[PDB]
PDB file of all heavy atoms in Angstrom:
ATOM      1  N   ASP A  91     123.004  81.882 103.111  1.00  8.47           N
ATOM      2  CA  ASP A  91     123.577  80.593 102.741  1.00  8.47           C
ATOM      3  C   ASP A  91     122.671  79.803 101.805  1.00  8.47           C
ATOM      4  O   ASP A  91     123.166  79.019 100.988  1.00  8.47           O
ATOM      5  CB  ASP A  91     123.874  79.774 103.999  1.00  8.47           C
ATOM      6  CG  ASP A  91     125.018  78.796 103.803  1.00  8.47           C
ATOM      7  OD1 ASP A  91     125.307  78.435 102.644  1.00  8.47           O
ATOM      8  OD2 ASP A  91     125.630  78.386 104.812  1.00  8.47           O
ATOM      9  N   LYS A  92     121.356  79.996 101.897  1.00  8.21           N
ATOM     10  CA  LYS A  92     120.386  79.232 101.115  1.00  8.21           C
ATOM     11  C   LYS A  92     119.830  80.035  99.947  1.00  8.21           C
ATOM     12  O   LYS A  92     118.652  79.911  99.602  1.00  8.21           O
ATOM     13  CB  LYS A  92     119.254  78.744 102.012  1.00  8.21           C
ATOM     14  CG  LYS A  92     119.686  78.407 103.426  1.00  8.21           C
ATOM     15  CD  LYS A  92     119.843  76.908 103.610  1.00  8.21           C
ATOM     16  CE  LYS A  92     119.482  76.493 105.025  1.00  8.21           C
ATOM     17  NZ  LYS A  92     120.141  77.363 106.036  1.00  8.21           N
ATOM     18  N   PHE A  93     120.660  80.871  99.321  1.00  8.34           N
ATOM     19  CA  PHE A  93     120.196  81.655  98.182  1.00  8.34           C
ATOM     20  C   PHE A  93     119.995  80.782  96.949  1.00  8.34           C
ATOM     21  O   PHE A  93     118.971  80.891  96.266  1.00  8.34           O
ATOM     22  CB  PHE A  93     121.186  82.781  97.888  1.00  8.34           C
ATOM     23  CG  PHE A  93     120.654  83.834  96.958  1.00  8.34           C
ATOM     24  CD1 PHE A  93     119.768  84.793  97.412  1.00  8.34           C
ATOM     25  CD2 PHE A  93     121.050  83.868  95.632  1.00  8.34           C
ATOM     26  CE1 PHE A  93     119.283  85.763  96.559  1.00  8.34           C
ATOM     27  CE2 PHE A  93     120.568  84.837  94.775  1.00  8.34           C
ATOM     28  CZ  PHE A  93     119.684  85.784  95.239  1.00  8.34           C
ATOM     29  N   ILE A  94     120.953  79.910  96.652  1.00  8.45           N
ATOM     30  CA  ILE A  94     120.910  79.069  95.462  1.00  8.45           C
ATOM     31  C   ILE A  94     120.380  77.700  95.865  1.00  8.45           C
ATOM     32  O   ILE A  94     120.923  77.056  96.770  1.00  8.45           O
ATOM     33  CB  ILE A  94     122.293  78.953  94.806  1.00  8.45           C
ATOM     34  CG1 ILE A  94     122.818  80.337  94.426  1.00  8.45           C
ATOM     35  CG2 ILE A  94     122.225  78.055  93.582  1.00  8.45           C
ATOM     36  CD1 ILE A  94     124.080  80.304  93.601  1.00  8.45           C
ATOM     37  N   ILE A  95     119.319  77.258  95.199  1.00  9.45           N
ATOM     38  CA  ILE A  95     118.715  75.957  95.473  1.00  9.45           C
ATOM     39  C   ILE A  95     118.629  75.172  94.170  1.00  9.45           C
ATOM     40  O   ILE A  95     117.693  75.383  93.387  1.00  9.45           O
ATOM     41  CB  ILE A  95     117.325  76.105  96.112  1.00  9.45           C
ATOM     42  CG1 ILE A  95     117.392  76.994  97.354  1.00  9.45           C
ATOM     43  CG2 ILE A  95     116.766  74.743  96.477  1.00  9.45           C
ATOM     44  CD1 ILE A  95     116.065  77.143  98.061  1.00  9.45           C
ATOM     45  N   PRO A  96     119.571  74.278  93.887  1.00 13.54           N
ATOM     46  CA  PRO A  96     119.455  73.454  92.681  1.00 13.54           C
ATOM     47  C   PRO A  96     118.277  72.497  92.778  1.00 13.54           C
ATOM     48  O   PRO A  96     117.871  72.080  93.865  1.00 13.54           O
ATOM     49  CB  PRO A  96     120.787  72.693  92.633  1.00 13.54           C
ATOM     50  CG  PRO A  96     121.326  72.758  94.014  1.00 13.54           C
ATOM     51  CD  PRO A  96     120.821  74.028  94.622  1.00 13.54           C
ATOM     52  N   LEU A  97     117.721  72.159  91.617  1.00 16.92           N
ATOM     53  CA  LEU A  97     116.586  71.243  91.513  1.00 16.92           C
ATOM     54  C   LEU A  97     116.966  70.128  90.543  1.00 16.92           C
ATOM     55  O   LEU A  97     116.923  70.318  89.325  1.00 16.92           O
ATOM     56  CB  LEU A  97     115.327  71.971  91.054  1.00 16.92           C
ATOM     57  CG  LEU A  97     115.006  73.287  91.762  1.00 16.92           C
ATOM     58  CD1 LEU A  97     113.803  73.961  91.125  1.00 16.92           C
ATOM     59  CD2 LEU A  97     114.769  73.051  93.242  1.00 16.92           C
ATOM     60  N   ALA A  98     117.329  68.969  91.084  1.00 18.24           N
ATOM     61  CA  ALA A  98     117.772  67.838  90.273  1.00 18.24           C
ATOM     62  C   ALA A  98     116.555  67.197  89.620  1.00 18.24           C
ATOM     63  O   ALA A  98     115.782  66.494  90.272  1.00 18.24           O
ATOM     64  CB  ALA A  98     118.535  66.834  91.129  1.00 18.24           C
ATOM     65  N   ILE A  99     116.383  67.438  88.321  1.00 17.71           N
ATOM     66  CA  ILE A  99     115.231  66.933  87.583  1.00 17.71           C
ATOM     67  C   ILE A  99     115.594  65.852  86.581  1.00 17.71           C
ATOM     68  O   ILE A  99     114.683  65.217  86.024  1.00 17.71           O
ATOM     69  CB  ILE A  99     114.481  68.072  86.864  1.00 17.71           C
ATOM     70  CG1 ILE A  99     115.365  68.678  85.773  1.00 17.71           C
ATOM     71  CG2 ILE A  99     114.068  69.135  87.856  1.00 17.71           C
ATOM     72  CD1 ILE A  99     114.618  69.039  84.513  1.00 17.71           C
ATOM     73  N   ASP A 100     116.877  65.618  86.330  1.00 16.01           N
ATOM     74  CA  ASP A 100     117.325  64.680  85.311  1.00 16.01           C
ATOM     75  C   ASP A 100     117.986  63.483  85.978  1.00 16.01           C
ATOM     76  O   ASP A 100     118.902  63.646  86.790  1.00 16.01           O
ATOM     77  CB  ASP A 100     118.301  65.357  84.346  1.00 16.01           C
ATOM     78  CG  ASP A 100     118.428  64.618  83.028  1.00 16.01           C
ATOM     79  OD1 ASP A 100     118.215  63.388  83.008  1.00 16.01           O
ATOM     80  OD2 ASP A 100     118.745  65.268  82.011  1.00 16.01           O
ATOM     81  N   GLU A 101     117.511  62.284  85.638  1.00 15.64           N
ATOM     82  CA  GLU A 101     118.112  61.067  86.170  1.00 15.64           C
ATOM     83  C   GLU A 101     119.414  60.716  85.464  1.00 15.64           C
ATOM     84  O   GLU A 101     120.310  60.130  86.081  1.00 15.64           O
ATOM     85  CB  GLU A 101     117.129  59.901  86.065  1.00 15.64           C
ATOM     86  N   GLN A 102     119.537  61.061  84.180  1.00 17.07           N
ATOM     87  CA  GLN A 102     120.726  60.717  83.411  1.00 17.07           C
ATOM     88  C   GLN A 102     121.957  61.510  83.829  1.00 17.07           C
ATOM     89  O   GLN A 102     123.068  61.144  83.433  1.00 17.07           O
ATOM     90  CB  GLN A 102     120.463  60.928  81.918  1.00 17.07           C
ATOM     91  N   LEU A 103     121.793  62.575  84.610  1.00 15.20           N
ATOM     92  CA  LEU A 103     122.920  63.347  85.121  1.00 15.20           C
ATOM     93  C   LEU A 103     123.326  62.773  86.472  1.00 15.20           C
ATOM     94  O   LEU A 103     122.579  62.883  87.451  1.00 15.20           O
ATOM     95  CB  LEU A 103     122.561  64.826  85.237  1.00 15.20           C
ATOM     96  CG  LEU A 103     123.638  65.714  85.866  1.00 15.20           C
ATOM     97  CD1 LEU A 103     124.660  66.138  84.825  1.00 15.20           C
ATOM     98  CD2 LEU A 103     123.020  66.929  86.539  1.00 15.20           C
ATOM     99  N   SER A 104     124.504  62.160  86.527  1.00 19.10           N
ATOM    100  CA  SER A 104     124.985  61.570  87.767  1.00 19.10           C
ATOM    101  C   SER A 104     125.281  62.651  88.798  1.00 19.10           C
ATOM    102  O   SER A 104     125.632  63.785  88.462  1.00 19.10           O
ATOM    103  CB  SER A 104     126.239  60.735  87.511  1.00 19.10           C
ATOM    104  OG  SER A 104     126.829  60.316  88.728  1.00 19.10           O
ATOM    105  N   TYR A 105     125.134  62.286  90.073  1.00 19.94           N
ATOM    106  CA  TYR A 105     125.397  63.224  91.157  1.00 19.94           C
ATOM    107  C   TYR A 105     126.879  63.534  91.319  1.00 19.94           C
ATOM    108  O   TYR A 105     127.221  64.449  92.074  1.00 19.94           O
ATOM    109  CB  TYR A 105     124.839  62.679  92.471  1.00 19.94           C
ATOM    110  CG  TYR A 105     123.560  63.349  92.915  1.00 19.94           C
ATOM    111  CD1 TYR A 105     122.460  62.597  93.307  1.00 19.94           C
ATOM    112  CD2 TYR A 105     123.452  64.732  92.946  1.00 19.94           C
ATOM    113  CE1 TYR A 105     121.289  63.204  93.715  1.00 19.94           C
ATOM    114  CE2 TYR A 105     122.284  65.349  93.351  1.00 19.94           C
ATOM    115  CZ  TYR A 105     121.206  64.579  93.734  1.00 19.94           C
ATOM    116  OH  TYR A 105     120.040  65.185  94.141  1.00 19.94           O
ATOM    117  N   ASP A 106     127.758  62.796  90.641  1.00 19.36           N
ATOM    118  CA  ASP A 106     129.190  63.051  90.680  1.00 19.36           C
ATOM    119  C   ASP A 106     129.686  63.873  89.499  1.00 19.36           C
ATOM    120  O   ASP A 106     130.848  64.290  89.503  1.00 19.36           O
ATOM    121  CB  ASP A 106     129.961  61.725  90.734  1.00 19.36           C
ATOM    122  N   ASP A 107     128.844  64.114  88.495  1.00 21.01           N
ATOM    123  CA  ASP A 107     129.234  64.848  87.300  1.00 21.01           C
ATOM    124  C   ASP A 107     128.751  66.293  87.307  1.00 21.01           C
ATOM    125  O   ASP A 107     128.890  66.983  86.292  1.00 21.01           O
ATOM    126  CB  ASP A 107     128.716  64.135  86.050  1.00 21.01           C
ATOM    127  CG  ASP A 107     129.317  62.756  85.873  1.00 21.01           C
ATOM    128  OD1 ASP A 107     130.379  62.488  86.475  1.00 21.01           O
ATOM    129  OD2 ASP A 107     128.731  61.940  85.132  1.00 21.01           O
ATOM    130  N   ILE A 108     128.187  66.765  88.421  1.00 23.36           N
ATOM    131  CA  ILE A 108     127.698  68.138  88.470  1.00 23.36           C
ATOM    132  C   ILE A 108     128.871  69.114  88.446  1.00 23.36           C
ATOM    133  O   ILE A 108     130.006  68.788  88.813  1.00 23.36           O
ATOM    134  CB  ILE A 108     126.813  68.360  89.706  1.00 23.36           C
ATOM    135  CG1 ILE A 108     127.595  68.073  90.987  1.00 23.36           C
ATOM    136  CG2 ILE A 108     125.586  67.472  89.643  1.00 23.36           C
ATOM    137  CD1 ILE A 108     126.773  68.240  92.244  1.00 23.36           C
ATOM    138  N   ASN A 109     128.585  70.336  88.001  1.00 23.77           N
ATOM    139  CA  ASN A 109     129.623  71.340  87.839  1.00 23.77           C
ATOM    140  C   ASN A 109     130.095  71.860  89.197  1.00 23.77           C
ATOM    141  O   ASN A 109     129.492  71.603  90.243  1.00 23.77           O
ATOM    142  CB  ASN A 109     129.125  72.495  86.972  1.00 23.77           C
ATOM    143  CG  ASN A 109     127.759  72.984  87.388  1.00 23.77           C
ATOM    144  OD1 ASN A 109     127.028  72.285  88.086  1.00 23.77           O
ATOM    145  ND2 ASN A 109     127.404  74.190  86.964  1.00 23.77           N
ATOM    146  N   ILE A 110     131.197  72.613  89.162  1.00 26.78           N
ATOM    147  CA  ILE A 110     131.851  73.086  90.376  1.00 26.78           C
ATOM    148  C   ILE A 110     131.076  74.181  91.090  1.00 26.78           C
ATOM    149  O   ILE A 110     131.361  74.469  92.258  1.00 26.78           O
ATOM    150  CB  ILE A 110     133.274  73.574  90.027  1.00 26.78           C
ATOM    151  CG1 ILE A 110     134.154  73.646  91.276  1.00 26.78           C
ATOM    152  CG2 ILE A 110     133.220  74.918  89.320  1.00 26.78           C
ATOM    153  CD1 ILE A 110     135.617  73.396  91.002  1.00 26.78           C
ATOM    154  N   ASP A 111     130.091  74.794  90.432  1.00 27.37           N
ATOM    155  CA  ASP A 111     129.369  75.899  91.057  1.00 27.37           C
ATOM    156  C   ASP A 111     128.392  75.402  92.117  1.00 27.37           C
ATOM    157  O   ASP A 111     128.203  76.057  93.148  1.00 27.37           O
ATOM    158  CB  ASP A 111     128.636  76.714  89.993  1.00 27.37           C
ATOM    159  CG  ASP A 111     129.563  77.635  89.226  1.00 27.37           C
ATOM    160  OD1 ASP A 111     130.073  78.604  89.828  1.00 27.37           O
ATOM    161  OD2 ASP A 111     129.782  77.389  88.022  1.00 27.37           O
ATOM    162  N   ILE A 112     127.765  74.252  91.884  1.00 28.71           N
ATOM    163  CA  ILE A 112     126.761  73.710  92.790  1.00 28.71           C
ATOM    164  C   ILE A 112     127.227  72.400  93.420  1.00 28.71           C
ATOM    165  O   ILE A 112     126.417  71.649  93.960  1.00 28.71           O
ATOM    166  CB  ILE A 112     125.409  73.532  92.080  1.00 28.71           C
ATOM    167  CG1 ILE A 112     125.579  72.659  90.838  1.00 28.71           C
ATOM    168  CG2 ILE A 112     124.821  74.881  91.710  1.00 28.71           C
ATOM    169  CD1 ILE A 112     124.330  71.912  90.435  1.00 28.71           C
ATOM    170  N   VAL A 113     128.529  72.110  93.354  1.00 31.76           N
ATOM    171  CA  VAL A 113     129.039  70.844  93.864  1.00 31.76           C
ATOM    172  C   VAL A 113     128.951  70.758  95.383  1.00 31.76           C
ATOM    173  O   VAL A 113     129.030  69.659  95.942  1.00 31.76           O
ATOM    174  CB  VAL A 113     130.486  70.623  93.387  1.00 31.76           C
ATOM    175  CG1 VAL A 113     131.469  71.326  94.310  1.00 31.76           C
ATOM    176  CG2 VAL A 113     130.796  69.139  93.295  1.00 31.76           C
ATOM    177  N   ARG A 114     128.786  71.887  96.070  1.00 34.31           N
ATOM    178  CA  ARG A 114     128.715  71.904  97.524  1.00 34.31           C
ATOM    179  C   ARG A 114     127.317  72.191  98.051  1.00 34.31           C
ATOM    180  O   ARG A 114     127.128  72.236  99.271  1.00 34.31           O
ATOM    181  CB  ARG A 114     129.700  72.932  98.089  1.00 34.31           C
ATOM    182  CG  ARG A 114     131.149  72.482  98.049  1.00 34.31           C
ATOM    183  CD  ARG A 114     131.837  72.744  99.375  1.00 34.31           C
ATOM    184  NE  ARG A 114     131.678  74.127  99.808  1.00 34.31           N
ATOM    185  CZ  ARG A 114     131.537  74.502 101.072  1.00 34.31           C
ATOM    186  NH1 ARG A 114     131.520  73.618 102.057  1.00 34.31           N
ATOM    187  NH2 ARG A 114     131.407  75.795 101.354  1.00 34.31           N
ATOM    188  N   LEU A 115     126.338  72.388  97.173  1.00 38.02           N
ATOM    189  CA  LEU A 115     124.961  72.636  97.573  1.00 38.02           C
ATOM    190  C   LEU A 115     124.144  71.357  97.447  1.00 38.02           C
ATOM    191  O   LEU A 115     124.331  70.578  96.508  1.00 38.02           O
ATOM    192  CB  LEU A 115     124.328  73.736  96.720  1.00 38.02           C
ATOM    193  CG  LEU A 115     125.094  75.051  96.573  1.00 38.02           C
ATOM    194  CD1 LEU A 115     124.688  75.757  95.292  1.00 38.02           C
ATOM    195  CD2 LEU A 115     124.845  75.944  97.774  1.00 38.02           C
ATOM    196  N   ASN A 116     123.234  71.148  98.395  1.00 38.62           N
ATOM    197  CA  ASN A 116     122.354  69.989  98.376  1.00 38.62           C
ATOM    198  C   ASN A 116     121.115  70.306  97.552  1.00 38.62           C
ATOM    199  O   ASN A 116     120.404  71.278  97.830  1.00 38.62           O
ATOM    200  CB  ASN A 116     121.963  69.578  99.795  1.00 38.62           C
ATOM    201  CG  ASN A 116     122.542  70.499 100.850  1.00 38.62           C
ATOM    202  OD1 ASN A 116     122.800  71.675 100.592  1.00 38.62           O
ATOM    203  ND2 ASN A 116     122.752  69.967 102.048  1.00 38.62           N
ATOM    204  N   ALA A 117     120.859  69.482  96.539  1.00 35.62           N
ATOM    205  CA  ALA A 117     119.761  69.716  95.619  1.00 35.62           C
ATOM    206  C   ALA A 117     118.444  69.241  96.228  1.00 35.62           C
ATOM    207  O   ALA A 117     118.387  68.738  97.353  1.00 35.62           O
ATOM    208  CB  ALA A 117     120.030  69.021  94.287  1.00 35.62           C
ATOM    209  N   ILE A 118     117.367  69.405  95.467  1.00 38.09           N
ATOM    210  CA  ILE A 118     116.044  68.921  95.837  1.00 38.09           C
ATOM    211  C   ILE A 118     115.633  67.892  94.796  1.00 38.09           C
ATOM    212  O   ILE A 118     115.616  68.189  93.595  1.00 38.09           O
ATOM    213  CB  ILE A 118     115.019  70.061  95.932  1.00 38.09           C
ATOM    214  CG1 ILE A 118     115.359  70.973  97.112  1.00 38.09           C
ATOM    215  CG2 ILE A 118     113.615  69.505  96.074  1.00 38.09           C
ATOM    216  CD1 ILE A 118     114.344  72.060  97.362  1.00 38.09           C
ATOM    217  N   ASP A 119     115.307  66.686  95.253  1.00 39.25           N
ATOM    218  CA  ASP A 119     115.107  65.556  94.352  1.00 39.25           C
ATOM    219  C   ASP A 119     113.775  65.697  93.625  1.00 39.25           C
ATOM    220  O   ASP A 119     112.707  65.551  94.229  1.00 39.25           O
ATOM    221  CB  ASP A 119     115.166  64.247  95.134  1.00 39.25           C
ATOM    222  CG  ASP A 119     115.585  63.074  94.272  1.00 39.25           C
ATOM    223  OD1 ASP A 119     116.018  63.303  93.124  1.00 39.25           O
ATOM    224  OD2 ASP A 119     115.483  61.922  94.744  1.00 39.25           O
ATOM    225  N   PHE A 120     113.838  65.985  92.327  1.00 39.17           N
ATOM    226  CA  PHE A 120     112.667  66.005  91.463  1.00 39.17           C
ATOM    227  C   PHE A 120     112.608  64.808  90.527  1.00 39.17           C
ATOM    228  O   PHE A 120     111.694  64.729  89.700  1.00 39.17           O
ATOM    229  CB  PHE A 120     112.636  67.294  90.636  1.00 39.17           C
ATOM    230  CG  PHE A 120     111.959  68.440  91.322  1.00 39.17           C
ATOM    231  CD1 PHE A 120     112.608  69.158  92.309  1.00 39.17           C
ATOM    232  CD2 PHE A 120     110.670  68.802  90.977  1.00 39.17           C
ATOM    233  CE1 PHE A 120     111.982  70.214  92.937  1.00 39.17           C
ATOM    234  CE2 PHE A 120     110.042  69.857  91.600  1.00 39.17           C
ATOM    235  CZ  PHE A 120     110.697  70.565  92.580  1.00 39.17           C
ATOM    236  N   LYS A 121     113.563  63.882  90.625  1.00 41.10           N
ATOM    237  CA  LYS A 121     113.593  62.751  89.705  1.00 41.10           C
ATOM    238  C   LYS A 121     112.508  61.734  90.037  1.00 41.10           C
ATOM    239  O   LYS A 121     111.872  61.179  89.135  1.00 41.10           O
ATOM    240  CB  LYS A 121     114.970  62.094  89.733  1.00 41.10           C
ATOM    241  CG  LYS A 121     116.115  63.078  89.884  1.00 41.10           C
ATOM    242  CD  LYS A 121     117.451  62.401  89.655  1.00 41.10           C
ATOM    243  CE  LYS A 121     118.580  63.178  90.309  1.00 41.10           C
ATOM    244  NZ  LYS A 121     119.913  62.637  89.930  1.00 41.10           N
ATOM    245  N   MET A 122     112.290  61.470  91.326  1.00 41.70           N
ATOM    246  CA  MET A 122     111.291  60.483  91.722  1.00 41.70           C
ATOM    247  C   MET A 122     109.876  61.008  91.504  1.00 41.70           C
ATOM    248  O   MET A 122     109.022  60.304  90.953  1.00 41.70           O
ATOM    249  CB  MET A 122     111.501  60.085  93.183  1.00 41.70           C
ATOM    250  CG  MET A 122     111.240  58.615  93.468  1.00 41.70           C
ATOM    251  SD  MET A 122     112.622  57.556  93.002  1.00 41.70           S
ATOM    252  CE  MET A 122     113.995  58.448  93.727  1.00 41.70           C
ATOM    253  N   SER A 123     109.611  62.244  91.923  1.00 43.75           N
ATOM    254  CA  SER A 123     108.266  62.800  91.835  1.00 43.75           C
ATOM    255  C   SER A 123     108.353  64.318  91.830  1.00 43.75           C
ATOM    256  O   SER A 123     109.037  64.902  92.674  1.00 43.75           O
ATOM    257  CB  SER A 123     107.395  62.320  93.001  1.00 43.75           C
ATOM    258  OG  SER A 123     106.098  62.885  92.938  1.00 43.75           O
ATOM    259  N   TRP A 124     107.658  64.949  90.880  1.00 43.88           N
ATOM    260  CA  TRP A 124     107.634  66.407  90.832  1.00 43.88           C
ATOM    261  C   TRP A 124     106.844  66.992  91.993  1.00 43.88           C
ATOM    262  O   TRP A 124     107.182  68.074  92.487  1.00 43.88           O
ATOM    263  CB  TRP A 124     107.044  66.880  89.506  1.00 43.88           C
ATOM    264  CG  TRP A 124     107.976  66.742  88.345  1.00 43.88           C
ATOM    265  CD1 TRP A 124     109.195  66.132  88.341  1.00 43.88           C
ATOM    266  CD2 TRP A 124     107.764  67.223  87.013  1.00 43.88           C
ATOM    267  NE1 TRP A 124     109.755  66.203  87.090  1.00 43.88           N
ATOM    268  CE2 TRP A 124     108.896  66.868  86.256  1.00 43.88           C
ATOM    269  CE3 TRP A 124     106.726  67.918  86.388  1.00 43.88           C
ATOM    270  CZ2 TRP A 124     109.020  67.185  84.907  1.00 43.88           C
ATOM    271  CZ3 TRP A 124     106.851  68.232  85.050  1.00 43.88           C
ATOM    272  CH2 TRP A 124     107.989  67.866  84.324  1.00 43.88           C
ATOM    273  N   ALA A 125     105.796  66.300  92.443  1.00 40.06           N
ATOM    274  CA  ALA A 125     104.984  66.824  93.535  1.00 40.06           C
ATOM    275  C   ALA A 125     105.718  66.727  94.867  1.00 40.06           C
ATOM    276  O   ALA A 125     105.607  67.626  95.706  1.00 40.06           O
ATOM    277  CB  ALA A 125     103.649  66.088  93.596  1.00 40.06           C
ATOM    278  N   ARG A 126     106.478  65.650  95.078  1.00 40.65           N
ATOM    279  CA  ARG A 126     107.308  65.562  96.277  1.00 40.65           C
ATOM    280  C   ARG A 126     108.397  66.630  96.269  1.00 40.65           C
ATOM    281  O   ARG A 126     108.706  67.222  97.311  1.00 40.65           O
ATOM    282  CB  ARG A 126     107.920  64.168  96.394  1.00 40.65           C
ATOM    283  N   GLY A 127     108.991  66.887  95.103  1.00 42.65           N
ATOM    284  CA  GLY A 127     109.950  67.975  95.001  1.00 42.65           C
ATOM    285  C   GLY A 127     109.328  69.326  95.302  1.00 42.65           C
ATOM    286  O   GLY A 127     109.936  70.164  95.973  1.00 42.65           O
ATOM    287  N   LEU A 128     108.112  69.558  94.805  1.00 37.72           N
ATOM    288  CA  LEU A 128     107.419  70.806  95.105  1.00 37.72           C
ATOM    289  C   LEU A 128     107.100  70.912  96.591  1.00 37.72           C
ATOM    290  O   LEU A 128     107.173  72.000  97.172  1.00 37.72           O
ATOM    291  CB  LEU A 128     106.145  70.914  94.271  1.00 37.72           C
ATOM    292  CG  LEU A 128     105.388  72.238  94.369  1.00 37.72           C
ATOM    293  CD1 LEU A 128     106.303  73.405  94.042  1.00 37.72           C
ATOM    294  CD2 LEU A 128     104.188  72.225  93.442  1.00 37.72           C
ATOM    295  N   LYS A 129     106.737  69.792  97.219  1.00 41.05           N
ATOM    296  CA  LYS A 129     106.514  69.783  98.661  1.00 41.05           C
ATOM    297  C   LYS A 129     107.783  70.157  99.413  1.00 41.05           C
ATOM    298  O   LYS A 129     107.741  70.940 100.371  1.00 41.05           O
ATOM    299  CB  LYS A 129     106.016  68.407  99.098  1.00 41.05           C
ATOM    300  CG  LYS A 129     105.521  68.341 100.528  1.00 41.05           C
ATOM    301  CD  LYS A 129     104.572  67.172 100.718  1.00 41.05           C
ATOM    302  CE  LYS A 129     105.040  66.258 101.835  1.00 41.05           C
ATOM    303  NZ  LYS A 129     103.981  65.291 102.229  1.00 41.05           N
ATOM    304  N   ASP A 130     108.923  69.607  98.990  1.00 41.57           N
ATOM    305  CA  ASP A 130     110.195  69.963  99.611  1.00 41.57           C
ATOM    306  C   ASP A 130     110.505  71.444  99.424  1.00 41.57           C
ATOM    307  O   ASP A 130     110.970  72.114 100.356  1.00 41.57           O
ATOM    308  CB  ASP A 130     111.319  69.104  99.032  1.00 41.57           C
ATOM    309  CG  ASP A 130     111.102  67.624  99.269  1.00 41.57           C
ATOM    310  OD1 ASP A 130     110.233  67.274 100.094  1.00 41.57           O
ATOM    311  OD2 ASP A 130     111.800  66.809  98.630  1.00 41.57           O
TER     312      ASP A 130
END
């Protein structure tokens, strides 16, 4: 179930405009901090 892991790195891309392939997967927030995203 956890094969695909999106990494949200762009703030200008709204969370409602993502494509249908990853619309049901929970991303990892890299917008606030890259090191916190790496920790996650």
Side-chain angles (χ1 to χ4, degrees), residues 91-100 103-105 107-125 127-130:
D91 208 338
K92 326 259 213 312
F93 194 77
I94 302 188
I95 306 182
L97 313 175
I99 66 141
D100 200 333
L103 175 84
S104 171
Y105 256 131
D107 297 341
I108 59 181
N109 47 342
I110 199 150
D111 283 292
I112 56 154
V113 84
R114 285 227 308 144
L115 309 155
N116 2 27
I118 292 185
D119 206 10
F120 273 78
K121 323 190 202 188
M122 217 80 47
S123 179
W124 285 7
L128 186 55
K129 190 158 124 167
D130 300 346

